[PDB]
Scaffold this active site. Sequence first.
Site, short mmCIF file in Angstrom:
data_model
loop_
_atom_site.label_atom_id
_atom_site.label_comp_id
_atom_site.label_asym_id
_atom_site.label_seq_id
_atom_site.Cartn_x
_atom_site.Cartn_y
_atom_site.Cartn_z
N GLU A 22 14.59 32.33 99.29
CA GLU A 22 14.59 31.62 98.28
C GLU A 22 12.97 31.31 97.91
OE1 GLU A 22 15.75 27.51 99.50
OE2 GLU A 22 15.48 26.86 97.58
N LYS A 52 17.71 33.41 96.15
CA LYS A 52 17.97 32.02 95.79
C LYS A 52 16.83 31.54 94.94
CE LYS A 52 18.99 27.33 97.22
NZ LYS A 52 19.01 26.31 98.27
#
Lengths: 360, 350, 350, 353
Positions: C187, C229
Amino acid sequence: PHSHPALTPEQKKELSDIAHRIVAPGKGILAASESTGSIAKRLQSIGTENTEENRRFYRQLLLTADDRVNPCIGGVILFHETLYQKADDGRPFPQVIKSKGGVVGIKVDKGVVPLAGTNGETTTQGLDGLSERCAQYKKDGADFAKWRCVLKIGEHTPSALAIMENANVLARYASICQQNGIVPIVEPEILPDGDHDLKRCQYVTEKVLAAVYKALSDHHIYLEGTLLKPNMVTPGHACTQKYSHEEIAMATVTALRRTVPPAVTGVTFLSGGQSEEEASINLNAINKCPLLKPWALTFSYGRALQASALKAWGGKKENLKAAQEEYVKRALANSLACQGKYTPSGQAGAAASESLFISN
Amino acid sequence: PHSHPALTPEQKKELSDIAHRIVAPGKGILAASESTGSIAKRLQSIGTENTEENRRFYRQLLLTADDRVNPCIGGVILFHETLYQKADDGRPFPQVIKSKGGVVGIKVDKGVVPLAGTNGETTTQGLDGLSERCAQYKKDGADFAKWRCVLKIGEHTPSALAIMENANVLARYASICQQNGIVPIVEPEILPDGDHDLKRCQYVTEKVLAAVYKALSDHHIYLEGTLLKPNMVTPGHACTQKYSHEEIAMATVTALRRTVPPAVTGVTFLSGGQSEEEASINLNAINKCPLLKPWALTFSYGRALQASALKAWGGKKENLKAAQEEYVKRALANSLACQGKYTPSSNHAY
Amino acid sequence: PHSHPALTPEQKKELSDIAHRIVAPGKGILAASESTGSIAKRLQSIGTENTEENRRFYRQLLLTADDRVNPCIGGVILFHETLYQKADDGRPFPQVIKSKGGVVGIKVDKGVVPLAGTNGETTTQGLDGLSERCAQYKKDGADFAKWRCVLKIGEHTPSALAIMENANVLARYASICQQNGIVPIVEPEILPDGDHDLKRCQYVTEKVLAAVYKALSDHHIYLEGTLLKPNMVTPGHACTQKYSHEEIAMATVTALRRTVPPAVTGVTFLSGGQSEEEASINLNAINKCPLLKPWALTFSYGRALQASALKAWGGKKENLKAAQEEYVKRALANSLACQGKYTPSSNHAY
Amino acid sequence: PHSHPALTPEQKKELSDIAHRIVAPGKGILAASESTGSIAKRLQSIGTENTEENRRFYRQLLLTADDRVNPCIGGVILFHETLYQKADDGRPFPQVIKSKGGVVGIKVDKGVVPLAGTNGETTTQGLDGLSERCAQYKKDGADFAKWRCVLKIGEHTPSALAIMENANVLARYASICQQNGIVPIVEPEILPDGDHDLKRCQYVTEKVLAAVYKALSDHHIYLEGTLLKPNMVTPGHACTQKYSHEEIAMATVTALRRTVPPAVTGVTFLSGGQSEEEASINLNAINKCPLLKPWALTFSYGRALQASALKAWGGKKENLKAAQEEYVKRALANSLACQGKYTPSGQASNHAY
């Protein structure tokens, strides 16, 4: 993790010996390698026609100054044309230079080109066929070379790309030069253009030099067989805040100490538009800076050595002696400066005080 | 790029002052920061139970050696446990060190961890909560720290990944230290294991250091406020070719001259398994090398300062004086060595 | 240029199988790993005391919603505390999640830390002892993890240092996870904060993802055994120029197509402050974008899946059903959205 | 972190449209850009004097093949000399190519040069004055270019320096091309020489391609306006272990899926020394590989399209038709292969990687 010697001990010795001779105590470099399009401007400033003969004559004027410059000039950088020209006595300029104890250098880059996707930034070209050119130049009397990369300080520059690419091409240039017995002068010039201050220039200079030496390491460059030609650390030409020469010297020496390995044989500062006096005074303050400096700190001046000369010449053959005398005066001053023994006597002249800066 | 001052002028002065004090003329570092598990083998070699008390007594023995070591020791690296122990007279060990003119150091890394996809290479961990630890350590007497990264010379090592990762983690550690007034000793140790020769070690050392300093630049590290703890340049332990101390000195100094910026305050060599005498003789040769060295070239010895002292002690409380005497002799030997004054009794080729 | 396999064919299969299950057609992720301090505002916004029991009750509320959410939820990310809590029936939460067809995930980073010398930029910590933590989480039911890096668009940010460092630490985290049979969700969140426009966000996103994947390659990361992500590509939260959902979709898909290797099993978008409807509509537009997308494009929503549920709950047990109903509604909306079947009722310019 | 658009939307559209036409379904590239020194060996293998006229006649032989090749050839790479030669009827070759539906390409690199300090490794030169050359070539009918970098698999190669430098120079070349409306074919060829196995080649190819795309990103290269010309992933020529076409395809497609962004318009494989039949079978297998492939997977064959034609010609004018027939046959076969429809008859695991 494996070594594949780029150079033999003999090759390293030759390169190291050359680099040391150029920056030997009290000696500097006369950068007279301006191209036709570059020198033409300087000739128009004195109403002199830009012809091959006039260029030849002007270069002869500089190269044949009296023996007082011998101990001052460790090397002379020439443009391709001049390397193959001869003095009035028929002696090739390289022979003239060598007879006075100087090493002959040659500019080998082919100019700057734009980096797409950047804010007016550039990289430099000239690698194509460089090996063969270096081999030929070596045979014709050249022992060192010069390649100029240009970076600019602005809101978004120099960019990560500009820094990485210019450091990489400099490394390629240095590698090829060393394979041909040519000492490469690495020139990563950070232009003085802008209103940034002294600390900003110091910050950028440190980042650029760090990138330059990492690239030279990656490309297996023999540092002892190279010279560095950086900009001194100064505020932007349009900066409001003023600084003393001691502050410029301290910022310059600090940046170098934080990035340049002791193995580098010498640092030959470019004048970058400074007046003849200013360039000499700053170089002197630099050598007097109270910090350990493991490398020779001298000059590789183009403009800062020719301002008064060009003006005294005015394209008139009868002003030969007058012109040469002005050049000799700046060579002696800088020779003392690179030793930290320069003290302006006050008779430099109005030409030696005029700014030689040109907007980019 | 743009400048966002990592340190203020005052912070820089503090770090530079600390760095210079540690490597002042004739001074070096006693590296006594072995962990419980690390000191285990050594205590086992002398049949001494590895208890906190014996570890306390041993460290006390070294830290309380007579005043002769004072001008020899500019700094002492301690393991966490020892930083909070006291001498029999109640004086905290940090106080003992400072009273003898030494700077207190602390090991802050949490050991090596395996790098997946490599031929047995590692990186080092210990960054988590490091800032808070440095602040606490500073408050408790420590002014410098140590972090060890380990690289190995082999057929395919050190790899690009290992060189890059270790240099990067060293830079992060250095950054955090400087934010807390702690001088970071950057230690990128290239093991002597293997049959490689002197040339090979010099090549790898040069490439490793070039990577280390580029990383310190990217992370905005203040070099004047740091120290470098590298391996000397030597042939591998299993190399059949022999070299003189002068050749070792030439390769070492040449390697450093080509990669270490003059701004670095000092170079403190690890002994890396060399014997007490060998480490001293090599450091001496390094300082006598006819090349220009813009930084202090001294020691940060663990094994090379404790070998004989440990053996003389033998875990016997009654051997205190005999043991300290051995440590003192090595402290004196290396102090002279880092000045090129110790005697037991073609650069283009690099 | 030599391979030293980080993973065996068996380890790769396990990782790839897990990653595919999480993002199977119509499925997304419920990000419920808010820490005590991060969920504090959420609870206080509804006058609810931030106790372990209320946190347990709230998590239970989401995790035990009816079977309508089963085909919508491929994975659920939990915070350490919650991974070890149980429902009223005594069932460990990981078991509750699995019994509903979901894969259990665990947040493993230890928050962001300041990068010295930058304009308020950060990197993330949490690598220390991560391998052992992963091994334990695996034994306790988790099959994937989450690590959040934060970058910001500003005058001089994200800087070269911030991009390189964050990309590098994400690679280290991913490497350690895969060594323990845990699928790492990478992420690299670029915050929407600021008045920058859509094109600026697209530029920065492209540069960051290019750096992220080069780092993953350098660290020998098995992409098929990972998920990404990222932030969707949108104008800054304070940008004066306005854009349509189709434009956001085109910018987002174009950025991903230019940087994310087809080997990446799936992309699970964070909602990053967008409202529940906005996040669903944008995800729907992204899936309807007329460009080829070689990876699943779904959700990993925290706020965008819990906003209405939290308010309907209000901290009262008698609102359990009403609250779950709101959660179900958003799970259903986003399940349709990740398939381009949700209804609220020129690429060369990119 | 600031954008300064290297290209306008119009320029991007032009580059994207060109790239797509070249690799349109069922089409590939005829690589006939051999230099004078390179084509010399080709002519000697058939006992034919290396003269400009003989070179022109040979290039004409390939370029003027019957209309059967039209749907097979999306592009033709020419050497400088050939770009300015004409067919017997006076038509410039670029015109001949375009009239048959092909896009004209030009080789612009100036060969490899040694990288000092390495074990026989090289980089490639040709950037000097490249912008002016590209503008001139564009004006004279060329819409795409080719630049070849060469890497070798050995004990210590490709080295970090070799990978970084070749990737960087390719990015510079790509950048200059796009500024002049020329679609750059990025060719980072990893030689098949050596006894390394399939996984070793796959590993190296993965590392090289990741470096190539990171460099293109750093230099702001517009991927949709580029093509990739890589080596297929195969074992070394001296490798003792044998592999099937299915394994070569799986290794190749896996390597690409892990490194090549989907924005890249197409991948045009080089034959790298494989026989004509082997190159076609491997290309067909690559296209049948049971994995998602977001880009066109076709050919940019030189030797794999000319082997038999050259032999059939033998430097004799009477063999013109026989020679053209050999080329046409390989064009049809590869056209089917880049569609996964190739069959000897005619027009009719994964976690271990």
